[model samples]
Target chain A: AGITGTWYNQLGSTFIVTAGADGALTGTFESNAESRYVLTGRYDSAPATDGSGTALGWTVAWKNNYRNAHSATTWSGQYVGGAEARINTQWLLTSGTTEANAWKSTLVGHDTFTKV
Target chain B: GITGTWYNQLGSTFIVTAGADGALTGTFESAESRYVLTGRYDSAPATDGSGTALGWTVAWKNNYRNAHSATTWSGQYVGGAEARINTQWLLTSGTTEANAWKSTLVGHDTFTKV
Candidate 1:
C-alpha cells in the first residue's frame, strides 16, 4: 500500500515502486539510463521497545539464473536497526580451479532505497 | 560452447542449458537453479585429500554483527573417489542471540549437481 517515488543507489540507478503483502516487498530495478532488472523480494520488522526496529531483516531475493561468467549468482540483503542503515555491496569474479583460487571484485557500490 | 540436452539431479528435477564466462552476467531465470549446502565447520580433516571433502572452517568473515540469526551459512558439498564425501542442507531459523545457538532448519534436501 505504498510506493517509493524515486529511489537511487550509489551506482546512480533509480528504482521502481515495490509492493508488499502482509509483510513482503516486491519489485524490479532500473538504471538511471533505462536499464531494467527483475528483482522480487520481501522486508519485515517486528514491534519492539528499543524503537530501533531491530530483529527485522529485509531479504531481497532473486531467481535469475543467467549466463553470467559466475554462471548463477543470487543476491540477498538484510536491513537491521532502522530503515536508514548504511550498506555497501561489491561484485567479485574469480578464475581459479578452486572456489578461492584467484578471486577478485570487479565493482563495488552501496544499495540505495527510500520508504514511501 | 557446449550445452547439455538434459541434466538431472537426484531430487528429480530436469535442467537445461547454461553457460559460463570469464567474468559474470546478469540475466533472468534461463533454465536452472543455484546449489546450497552446509555441514559442521569443525569436521574438516586435512590439507590435501586428508579424509574427505569435509566441512568449512571460519575465522572472522561471518558478516552479520547483531540482529538476525545465522548470518553466513555456506551452501557446500564434498565428494571423493578414494576419500569420504557427504552432503546435506537445511533452512534454519535460529534465535537472534547466538551464532551457533537455537538454530532450527525449516527444511533442506541433499544438494544435487553442484
Candidate 2:
C-alpha cells in the first residue's frame, strides 16, 4: 500500500507521487481547470488495514503566479478497498501582496481527490 | 560579481548565481555544522540599501532528519571582493526529532569570493 502512484481529483486535477527510500514522498500537482497551475508537496503515508479511518495524510504548498499568492493544502483520507482513495483537502491562501486583501476566498474550499 | 564560489570562516560554502528569472538563486552547504544541510535559496535586493536579502521559506529540509527549516541571510558586499552576511535560522519542523536540538541560531560570517 505505497502512496506512489498517479491520483486525480473530482475536477480532473492530477498528482504524480513518488516515494523515497526514507518513507518521504514528493510529488507534483497539475491543476487542469481552476488555475492551470503546477505545484509540489511532500507526503508521509501510514497505511491502515482496517480502512475505517485515515489511511494517509499529506501537506502541499504552492504559489499562484497569476494571482501572486501563496497557498497550502492539507489532505487526509482513507483507501477504499485498496484500489481507490477518497481524500478531503483544506486549502487556504497563506500570503500575498495585493491579492491577499482582494482575495475573497482566502480561507476556503474543501475539495475531494480520488485515486484513479 | 556576486555570482561565484564563496567560503566562510565557519567552513560553509555557497555557490550562488542568477536564477532563471534573473533573481539570485543558489545552494548552501556546510560540513562543519550539525545541520550539514544543502538547499537552494532565492534572494532579492533590499530597497533599504542594506544589501541583498535572501530567504528560504518552506523549501528547506534537513538531510538527516528531513526536518523543515527556514533561513534568512542579509548580505552586503565589502569593497567589491568580500561579503558580510548576517544569518538567522529557524527550525519550523515541529517534530520531536527537530525539537530535540536548538531551534534557532543567529550569527555573522564573512565570505571571500573564491
Candidate 3:
C-alpha cells in the first residue's frame, strides 16, 4: 500500500510505479495523452520497507517517435497513504537545449496525485 | 493483459506476469543469461498506436556473469491473437555532466507474443 500503484494527477496524466528490491523506483509517466515517458527515482526505504516516503523524487524524460525533444520533467514530493492515497508534490519542466543548462524553459507546477 | 511469454527480434525471451497492483515482473533471457525485470503495466493507451502501456527494467547485476549496467524499456502492448510490444530502450552504463549525456545508449525493438 505504498506509492507502487497507478496514480493520476488533475492535469490528465497517469503515473504507474513499480518498486525495486533495492529501493529504486521505476515506471511510466504519460501526459497530454502522449507516449509513456521513462520514470526513475529514489525513495527512502529505511524506516519503511514498503517503498513509501516523502522525500521521493522522480524524472520523466519526454520522448516520442516524432520530432526532436529536449524536454523533461521531475517531481519531488511526499507520498501519503490512506483511503485515497496521493502524492503532494511539485515539478519543474526543463527544456530549450540539451546542453546542461538553465531554468529558461523551466516551469513550476504542483499537483495532488490520487490512487485510482 | 500481457501475462504470457514473449520474444523480441533479438531472439531474447521474457515471460511477464502482471500484478494486481500493476507491477510487472519478468524473467528475461539473453546470451544464455537470465535476469529479472521490474516495471508497471497500465490500462492507459500506448504512446504510439492502439494498445496498453507497458514498461520494465532489467538490472544486469543479477546477471549470471559479467555483471553489467542496467537497461530499461518503455513500451506499449498491442494485444490480440498475437500481441506485440513496441518499445524504446535506454541503457545507462555510466554518466557525467560534461556533455550532460554521452554515456547512455538508446534503441528500439518489437516483441511478439509466442
Candidate 4:
C-alpha cells in the first residue's frame, strides 16, 4: 500500500512503516534529526467520500528527552494516496504534563509527509 | 512579543500570550465561553525574510454546555504595516482516545492584529 515504506516529510524528517491487516500502523519518526522514536497510529485506506483525504493520527512520546524531559507530540493528518502520496499534518507538542503547563507549554506545527 | 489581540469575522476575540521557547498560550472568547489555547510560532525564517509560520489549539474544556473537545489551528503569519494570520483548523470531539481524528471537522479563518 502507499502508506508503507520510508517516507520523508517537509521538515526533513523520516517516517518508515508497515501496516497491519486490521489498519494498525507501526512506524518510526526521525523528526528533523537523527534521533528516532516510536510511532503508533491508525490509517484509513478507504478513499474519503468527500475527497478531503483519509483521516489519521499518530503520536511519539519522546521518552529520551530529545527536546525536553517532559515532552511528546501528536500529529493528526489527512493522507492521500496516488502516484505522489502525501500526509498533511497538524501537530501539538506538549511539555510538562500539568493541566496549566500543558496548555501553556504546548506547541503546534504543520508538516507534510510524502511517500511515493 | 506577538502578545496581540484579535477578533474573527464572527465577533469572537482571541487574546494571546508569548511563553518560553516559541510556545503560544492564549484566551479565545465567544459570547458564551472563554477558552484556553496553546500553539507555536517559529521566529526563524528565510534569508529573504518573507514570513513565519504559526499554529494553536483551543481547548473547549467543556465550558458551558460544550463537551471535551479541542480545535487546532494551523497557519502562517504574513507581515506588513498590518500583520495578519491565515489559518486552517480541525475540530474534534468525544473521540476515540487512540484516534481522536475520527470526528474531524475542518474550517478556515483570517485574523488581523487589532
Instruction: Give the candidate number with the greatest TM-score.
Output: 4
Per-residue error (Å), model 4, residue A87: 0.8
Return the lDDT, model 3, position B42. 90
Docking class of 3: incorrect
Estimate, for each residue in A1-116, the C-alpha lDDT of model 2 and write its tens digit.
45567778766568877766555557667664345444444443454555454445566566545553365555555435345555556443333336324322233245566666
Q: Write the per-residue lDDT of candidate 3 for residues A7-102, one digit (tens) a residue.
A: 898767888998666778999887644566778998766546565555688988777554436777788888876676788987766676543333
Q: What is the TM-score ranking, best to worst?
A: 4, 3, 2, 1
Better of 1 and 4 by DockQ: 4
In model 4, what is chain B's TM-score? 0.81
Task: Please give the distance, in angstroms, between residue A67's alpha carbon in candidate 3 and its true position after superposition.
Answer: 30
In terms of DockQ, which candidate is stronger, 1 or 3?
Answer: 1
**Cα deviation of A47 in candidate 3 (Å)?**
51
Q: Residue B26 in model 4: shift from native, Å?
A: 17
Q: Which stretches of model 4 miss by more than 4 angstroms?
A: A31-34, A49-52, A65-68, A97-100, B1-114
Model 2 RMSD, rounded to 1 decimal: 17.5
Classify candidate 2 by CAPRI docking class.
incorrect
Tens digit of lDDT per residue, candidate 3, span B15-66?
Answer: 8898878889879887448888789989455566577877899977662464
Chain A TM-score, cand. 2: 0.57
lDDT of 2 by residue, B32-99 (tens): 23332233333445556565544332335555544455555544543344455444443232436424
